[PDB]
């Protein structure tokens, strides 16, 4: 009801992408994804696998 349905997330996700379009979301994600990149790089030296 609240949104546990996966399909509910799919339709909602689509609207967000359309309104923000792929161009804005690319820069926003990449800009905010910069911190994630450091986490991956730092863990590059180690090898959990």
Q: Alpha helices, DSSP H only, in the chain?
A: 6-32, 34-42
Number of domains in the chain: 1
- For residues 25 and 17, is the Cβ–Cβ distance under 8 A? yes
The method recorded for this entry reads: NMR
Nearest to 17 by CA among 6, 28, 7: 28
Which residue range forms the structural domain that includes residue 29? 2-49
CATH at residue 9: 1.20.5.3310
Separation CA 6–CA 22 (nearest Å): 22
Tokens 């590059």, residue located: 44
- Listed in sequence order, the residues at least 6 apart from 3 whose beta carbon sits closer than 8 Å to its beta carbon are 9, 12
Cα atoms in the 13 Å half-sphere on the side-chain side of 2: 1
């Amino acid at each position: 009801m609240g949104g546990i349905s996966i399909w509910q997330l799919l339709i909602i996700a689509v609207i967000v992408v359309l309104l923000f379009g792929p161009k804005k979301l690319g820069s926003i994600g990449s800009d905010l994804g910069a911190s994630i990149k450091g986490f991956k790089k730092a863990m590059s030296d180690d090898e959990p696998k």
